[PDB]
Design a protein around this motif. Sequence first.
Motif, short mmCIF file in Angstrom:
data_model
loop_
_atom_site.label_atom_id
_atom_site.label_comp_id
_atom_site.label_asym_id
_atom_site.label_seq_id
_atom_site.Cartn_x
_atom_site.Cartn_y
_atom_site.Cartn_z
N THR A 116 0.80 -1.20 0.00
CA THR A 116 0.00 0.00 0.00
C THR A 116 0.85 1.28 0.00
N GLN A 117 2.18 1.16 -0.16
CA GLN A 117 3.10 2.29 -0.16
C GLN A 117 4.08 2.24 -1.35
N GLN A 118 4.09 3.31 -2.14
CA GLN A 118 4.98 3.43 -3.32
C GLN A 118 5.04 2.13 -4.11
N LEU A 136 0.76 14.97 5.38
CA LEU A 136 1.28 14.24 6.54
C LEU A 136 2.23 13.11 6.13
N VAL A 137 2.70 13.15 4.90
CA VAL A 137 3.59 12.12 4.40
C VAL A 137 4.99 12.67 4.14
N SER A 138 5.92 11.78 3.82
CA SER A 138 7.33 12.17 3.75
C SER A 138 7.72 13.01 2.53
N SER A 139 6.78 13.19 1.60
CA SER A 139 6.95 14.10 0.47
C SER A 139 6.46 15.52 0.76
N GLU A 144 6.07 20.68 8.72
CA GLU A 144 6.92 19.71 9.43
C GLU A 144 6.27 18.33 9.38
N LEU A 145 7.08 17.30 9.18
CA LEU A 145 6.64 15.92 9.33
C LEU A 145 6.73 15.63 10.83
N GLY A 146 5.57 15.50 11.46
CA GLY A 146 5.51 15.30 12.90
C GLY A 146 6.10 13.96 13.31
N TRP A 147 6.57 13.88 14.54
CA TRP A 147 7.26 12.67 14.98
C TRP A 147 6.31 11.49 15.06
N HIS A 148 6.86 10.32 14.73
CA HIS A 148 6.07 9.10 14.57
C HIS A 148 6.97 7.88 14.78
N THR A 149 6.38 6.79 15.26
CA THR A 149 6.88 5.47 14.96
C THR A 149 6.45 5.11 13.53
N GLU A 150 7.38 4.63 12.73
CA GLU A 150 7.07 4.25 11.38
C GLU A 150 6.02 3.13 11.41
N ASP A 151 4.94 3.29 10.65
CA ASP A 151 3.86 2.31 10.58
C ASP A 151 3.34 1.87 11.94
N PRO A 201 -3.53 3.92 10.58
CA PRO A 201 -2.52 4.02 9.54
C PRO A 201 -2.35 5.44 9.07
N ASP A 202 -1.11 5.83 8.81
CA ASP A 202 -0.83 7.16 8.32
C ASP A 202 -1.20 7.26 6.84
N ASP A 203 -1.12 8.48 6.33
CA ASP A 203 -1.68 8.80 5.02
C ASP A 203 -0.90 8.19 3.86
N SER A 204 0.31 7.70 4.12
CA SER A 204 1.13 7.09 3.07
C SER A 204 0.51 5.79 2.55
N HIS A 205 -0.42 5.23 3.33
CA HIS A 205 -1.08 3.98 3.00
C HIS A 205 -2.44 4.19 2.32
N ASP A 246 0.61 12.79 15.49
CA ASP A 246 -0.66 13.23 14.92
C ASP A 246 -1.84 12.31 15.26
N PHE A 247 -1.65 11.00 15.12
CA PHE A 247 -2.76 10.09 14.97
C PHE A 247 -3.10 9.26 16.21
N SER A 248 -2.17 9.17 17.16
CA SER A 248 -2.47 8.46 18.40
C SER A 248 -3.63 9.15 19.09
N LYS A 309 16.85 7.91 -0.07
CA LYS A 309 16.33 6.55 -0.30
C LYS A 309 16.05 5.97 1.08
N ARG A 310 15.02 5.13 1.14
CA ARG A 310 14.53 4.62 2.42
C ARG A 310 14.20 3.14 2.33
N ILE A 311 14.38 2.43 3.45
CA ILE A 311 14.11 1.00 3.49
C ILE A 311 13.64 0.60 4.90
N1 LIG Z 1 2.87 12.30 9.75
C1 LIG Z 1 2.68 11.35 10.65
N2 LIG Z 1 2.43 11.78 11.88
N3 LIG Z 1 2.78 10.04 10.37
C2 LIG Z 1 3.02 9.42 9.03
C3 LIG Z 1 4.29 9.70 8.19
C4 LIG Z 1 5.12 8.48 7.69
O1 LIG Z 1 6.51 8.83 7.67
C5 LIG Z 1 4.82 7.85 6.30
N4 LIG Z 1 5.36 6.49 6.22
C6 LIG Z 1 5.39 8.59 5.09
O2 LIG Z 1 6.38 8.18 4.46
O3 LIG Z 1 4.78 9.58 4.71
#
Ligand SMILES: N=C(N)NCC[C@H](O)[C@H](N)C(=O)O
Length: 332
Positions: A116-118, A136-139, A144-151, A201-205, A246-248, A309-311
């Motif tokens: 569901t991502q890229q 709210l995504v990395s693009s 600011e991209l707010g702090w998060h645990t990835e996924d 789930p964040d908006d990247s999905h 953001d989402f918690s 680049k990200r992994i």
């Molecule tokens: N913006 C928040 N709070 N969360 C989602 C961001 C993530 O880094 C997402 N995987 C992204 O790449 O956009």
Amino acid sequence: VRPWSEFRLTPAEAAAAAALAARCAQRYDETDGPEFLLDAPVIAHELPRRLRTFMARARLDAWPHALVVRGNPVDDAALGSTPVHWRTARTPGSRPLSFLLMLYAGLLGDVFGWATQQDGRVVTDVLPIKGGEHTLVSSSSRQELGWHTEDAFSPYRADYVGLLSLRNPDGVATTLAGVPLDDLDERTLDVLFQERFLIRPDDSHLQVNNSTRVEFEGIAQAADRPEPVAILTGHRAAPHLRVDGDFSAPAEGDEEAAAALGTLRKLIDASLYELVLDQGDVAFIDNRRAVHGRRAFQPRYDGRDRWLKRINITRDLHRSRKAWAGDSRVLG
Ligand SMILES: N=C(N)NCC[C@H](O)[C@H](N)C(=O)O
Ligand SMILES: NC(=[NH2+])NCCC[C@H](N)C(=O)O
Ligand SMILES: [Fe+2]
């Protein structure tokens, strides 16, 4: 003193690593192909020994928020312009560096992507997309991209998130924070260890952030009907962390949970710090110990924007077996 562990390649070591990545790029068709996915961890055994020692040891340390490797050469003329979208971002100039990231990652664990991502790519791209500044995504950029645990929403989230800086001419900072253990009172800590929180789930999905199937159904389920989960797990003296600034949310009407989450937000905001990934720097962020984000910046859109680049890396691909989406390396 730094909250991450750092290694700097000598010029000879960096050249050796680059030459190995270049040879891989000659020998395999793509980073994400089944063949290289299987072979990369064994090819990585040929990387410079001092780097292999660092990766093996630093991963086992109790404290770092990230493992950072400095000093990989990147030639902007060879690299070419920053792509305008992730879709077209597998450019020939970036290809050896994508192989390099995969090799470093293979020292740490099993790489994977998300259906569901890229487009289910394992090596993904972080770059500003015109029109997408305030998302709210990395693009994003201007926001600011707010702090998060990835996924954070998923039990199958990465153990480590790798980031390779292809270019960052204006020195835009990644942000990091660990658990604010020096400030969390016991009662608050106790509540954060209970299953009293929601995390979607964040908006990247979202479908809107992929190209023109079934795995999006699971994302919908996780957004519409999140199950309560804890924010902290494991050892009370060194907890693992699962949160999205953001989402918690608290479980419905649970005001004690809400207070604990509000306190956590304040304390993480107060302790957030910066890590600038200069061109050629690689970071592996410990996604159980730390949240991460990225500072606001004004995008250029002139061909020289910041580009990573990200992994995603897990210590155990089998943990996500349920989510294996018709193969083990793309999840949903
Ligand atoms: N913006 C928040 N709070 N969360 C989602 C961001 C993530 O880094 C997402 N995987 C992204 O790449 O956009
Ligand atoms: N897992 C594999 N089948 N690896 C072999 C793939 C062939 C690849 N061109 C190589 O240099 O080896
Ligand atoms: Fe992230």
